[PDB]
Design a protein around this ligand. Sequence first.
Ligand SMILES: O=C(O)c1cn(C2CC2)c2cc(N3CCNCC3)c(F)cc2c1=O
Ligand SMILES: O=C(O)c1cn(C2CC2)c2cc(N3CCNCC3)c(F)cc2c1=O
Ligand SMILES: [Mn+2]
Ligand SMILES: [Mn+2]
Ligand SMILES: [Mn+2]
Ligand SMILES: [Mn+2]
Lengths: 669, 669
Amino acid sequence: KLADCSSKSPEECEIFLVEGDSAGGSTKSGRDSRTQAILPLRGKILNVEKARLDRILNNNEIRQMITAFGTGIGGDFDLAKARYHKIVIMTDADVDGAHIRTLLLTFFYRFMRPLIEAGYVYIAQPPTKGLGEMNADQLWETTMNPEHRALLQVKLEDAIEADQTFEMLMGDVVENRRQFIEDNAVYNERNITSEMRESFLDYAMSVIVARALPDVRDGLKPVHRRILYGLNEQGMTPDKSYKKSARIVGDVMGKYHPHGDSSIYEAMVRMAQDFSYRYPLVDGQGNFGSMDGDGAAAMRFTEARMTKITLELLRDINKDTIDFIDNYDGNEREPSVLPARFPNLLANGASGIAVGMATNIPPHNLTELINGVLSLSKNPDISIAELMEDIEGPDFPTAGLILGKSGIRRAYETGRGSIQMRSRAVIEERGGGRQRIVVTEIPFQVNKARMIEKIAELVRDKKIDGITDLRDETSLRTGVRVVIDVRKDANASVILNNLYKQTPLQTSFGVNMIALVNGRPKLINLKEALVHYLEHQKTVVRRRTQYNLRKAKDRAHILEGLRIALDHIDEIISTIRESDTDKVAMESLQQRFKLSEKQAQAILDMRLRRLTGLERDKIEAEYNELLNYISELETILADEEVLLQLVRDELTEIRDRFGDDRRTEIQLG
Amino acid sequence: KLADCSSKSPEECEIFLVEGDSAGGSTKSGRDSRTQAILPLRGKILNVEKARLDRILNNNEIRQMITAFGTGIGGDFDLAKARYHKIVIMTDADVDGAHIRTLLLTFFYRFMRPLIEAGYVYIAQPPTGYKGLGEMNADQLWETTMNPEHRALLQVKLEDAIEADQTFEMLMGDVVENRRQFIEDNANERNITSEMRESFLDYAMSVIVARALPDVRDGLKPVHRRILYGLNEQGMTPDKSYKKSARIVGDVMGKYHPHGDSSIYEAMVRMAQDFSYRYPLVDGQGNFGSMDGDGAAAMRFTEARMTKITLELLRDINKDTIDFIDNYDGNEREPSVLPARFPNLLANGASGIAVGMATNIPPHNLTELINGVLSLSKNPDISIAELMEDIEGPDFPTAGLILGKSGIRRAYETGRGSIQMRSRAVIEERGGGRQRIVVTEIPFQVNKARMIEKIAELVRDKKIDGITDLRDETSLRTGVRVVIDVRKDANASVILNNLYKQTPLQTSFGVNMIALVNGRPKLINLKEALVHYLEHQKTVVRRRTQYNLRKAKDRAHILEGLRIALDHIDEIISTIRESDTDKVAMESLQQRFKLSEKQAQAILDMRLRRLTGLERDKIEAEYNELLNYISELETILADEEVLLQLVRDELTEIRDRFGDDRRTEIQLG
DNA sequence: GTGCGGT
DNA sequence: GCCGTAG
DNA sequence: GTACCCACGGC
DNA sequence: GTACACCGCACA
Ligand SMILES: O=C(O)c1cn(C2CC2)c2cc(N3CCNCC3)c(F)cc2c1=O
Ligand SMILES: O=C(O)c1cn(C2CC2)c2cc(N3CCNCC3)c(F)cc2c1=O
Ligand SMILES: [Mn+2]
Ligand SMILES: [Mn+2]
Ligand SMILES: [Mn+2]
Ligand SMILES: [Mn+2]
């Protein structure tokens, strides 16, 4: 791993802790060959304030640094054997780079605290993006070159203060770490604390607001918007043909999302499972996993492409219904949020683990979710207990069962709640006084065979009894189906209701609805959830109708001047011929006909065949049809209750085209 | 990594060897746990024919199979002890799988031959030439290939004791010649030896034309061609900014080349190393490896575009210059050969290992190379040694020196020769009567690092005396420069003369100039190569000229149609007004103006803009000059010799523009 | 024991 | 201990 | 082209 | 994220 230096007298030495490997062997040619040692960390390291001392003492990066430090840790730290008087921490200049920073610091205050004081702790000044993508000496000259390199020694100033920060930030009290976050939510020396409060604040945020949280409008995280905008743009629409995966990842990684390949493929892969997603936004072709936890074949071996329902996610996008922004480097654009013409958030659900928070939303039945909004339009002052009159509860893709209106009903209420999910099981008598236990629908997010290696574990472990055999017989002809053989005399129902206890045959969805609303992290309710979506349904379908307006009048102006042109044809054709530079002609048609630049230019673009019979006539046939569209579009605008209908019209056309009954059963009791 | 059936009874039990990891995983999921137990193969196996036992045994894919079956190797063999009674070999309908299928066959015959006799050794028949096993679902893998209902298998029959041993020997044998020969000669139950022949052969063939064998005409292998083709389709010519490596490959792979991004990358990557390619065919961004032998960066982190010199490989390609082929899936088109407006093969070099053969080709200096072409183009009866007044021999990007003319000399005569690559070390003074050797240039293809290490390995191992320090001091200024101290008052030149014959300071280039000629593996001497090249160019300029002409012949024609109307215009204006459709309007213009169907449209489709003064003379000015062009072309076509000097000039301008000094120094005595 | 496109 | 996007 | 670490939060 | 191991030649 490490690459060491010739000078074995620490003084003229120093080690660089450099983020990745891509940037690690770059640095392995920029670096001086006799005064500069490199230690490539292989990825985000252990937290030393979360895990106890036997763990710390193990994660390889953690060990690897100790020896390579020489000083020895804890209370054996002889800062004398200190191999380096200048240890540089050269983390990428991204968020996961300041984030890797805090993690090394947390290790260098509790385990080499004298080191910080000593005067060896450093922070190279990488030029701003990305680390890896630099040359070997492009790495020497800005960062490892003493002649030109900008560094940072970490002054531990007030140990009383730091001692208190380091616990809040990397401590086990998630809730402390949030309170700070929420409060600071604005949208040649370096003090160790002056570092953390920023180097973690930026990360805490960007993770919350540009990683692990699904917007409230499209119900989408970024890595998803960017996979569904790219299917969009690359025009791999459902009527067309599957593209290989690594080609869309190729496209998406390039343009919008500078991150690992793995993160993007496995992400679009989920969007592609009839069991993961309630309403799959991807057409998977090729091996795409299975319920046993198996993973889609590698991105080079599969194909995807939009789904019919995905269009509704991006329908009317090009009519200016949402704001585009430059991408990451400013060479491309991307949607800030897609149209989401259909209740996507609650429909498909969500799960993500943040920094301060985490979110968990269940998948609900679209049809149910629609009436919900439908009713929700006709009454801004509606009660959840009523919204729930249209929305029985979530509906998992795994069907399965749900217990009580009660676990369900609090979630929606207050925002957080607990739902007990349970498998579809049946007892059936095999005669001769015998029994057997046949699950056909496990719960949602429940790895099939690991529930079975889980019952396998019990039976061989004599922790539960009276089961003779355990077969998976599941066929893509029967649906899920776990047959459990029961012994004679021994009671099965017993063995059933103990398999709910002891195994995932019964599991619980921890509803906790933190979605990104108005830009920030937010716990919300069923009412709130649809309200802010219905809002984005008003705020799309409106902005469109106005673009159609604009796009409408714009054409009827060009037409106006066009008909005038066909009506005084004979003079127009000579006022051109008798004009040399078309700059002059544009100057004629205007004065003589009371016309406008955009109009006289247009005429000067008219093709001879636009003068035949139909083509002439067709033309004015287009005009009188536009003015119905125009007044209408304005009718639509000058009466809320109309635009509002369009919304209901459309939200209902959807519910009639894609709606599907319920799979999950809500059992009352 | 074998997922064994619950079943413990051979008569019903059948193992599966699958092509990939992925293939394997789908198989494992669409398989019957009851009776179908699957052992996947990670890539390639071992040749138990070419390799000897200590080595076979210590190998994995064999042992893995050995335990699986649970029978025994060679004499230990016992038909009863066998876990399974169907051993199914599942590789895909791709040559590479054809050959793997012939690699496992090897095993079963050399070690479990008796096993074959019982009929346990089976072959699986996936759908033909559709795709990689891995593409299909697990359900798609069961329904066509594994389900006993609709599955077709080939039972391997050992027909003749006598011929089988020899055949296996020949195809998988140590002796190259007999495999080279067999190939060339050939240029339910299944007969195993007719199967080892065809599927091996079917494979061996692809690996030549469409694998690791440069074309004579463009110098390019399928893999590079393919990268350079698409570079030019994406349109990232040197003038355009870099665009990530991931996008590029994902693309070449998703339009042309069905293989490992890893293989595509490090191939594309080479093209971009100024020390790899005499004239780099790419222009990278970030870490693209370096001399001492560090691989390149991760295709995520890098960017890439053509060189200005690559522009000339794809000059005039969309001008009907060379035939087009359909891509592996028939969903896109690709060039069968890049136009190569410069002699790439002998320029950049090339060196792969095929089947029964292998090419190895040096680099030369473009300037030299062109001059030889011009002179040979001039004297098509020119003596080889007359070509050497122009072409003195190779020229490695690394530079260096060569040792003697008969070395180069017989290389260019029989296709093959041995060329002495030394280095340029200088001896000089370090101070105090103490000396030093200094090496500033290494043999091409020599790895600077492994050269330095493998010198210590001879001092430490006291196999070379008087060496008292050796650093490698290569910076960007020094370029290459390695220092070797000589214990003063000791003959530095006697060491240097030994380090030469001991290590990689001096290396043998074993030239075997083979490359696809008239579509087959040929051996060509300097001339043929130049000729084959030369003829390509003669056959390109002509076709371009053929195309530049039907394009002018076609545009003059129209330039007229317009003129015509532009003159007799008011009546033109009338014919159309007085007409109801373009149909009549045409058919009217066509006859009552003598206008061609073609010219008629050209007017029907003419904007008013061209009624003015200028626009009527921009036509005029354009029409006349198209006559002076067709003049030229009709001149260049109608003569074997102008077509021949257009080439000479056109190449005489490349050399003029991209041509450079010699770096490798040619010494004798 | 090594170059290069392949599983 | 695992739900999922990032080193 | 897959194996083997980490964070981050809730239950 | 490097480790990991194989076909295929020819020539030291
Ligand atoms: O595309 C590639 O570069 C590789 C692909 N594969 C798998 C075959 C597709 C590899 C597999 C390797 N192993 C699997 C077989 N036994 C262990 C080693 C390997 F070492 C390297 C590679 C590649 O470089
Ligand atoms: O992009 C990714 O999925 C990964 C990237 N990296 C490095 C950051 C690029 C990893 C590094 C890992 N390590 C394994 C050995 N011990 C610590 C580092 C790892 F297990 C997984 C990954 C990835 O999955
Ligand atoms: Mn980064
Ligand atoms: Mn990963
Ligand atoms: Mn294949
Ligand atoms: Mn590889």
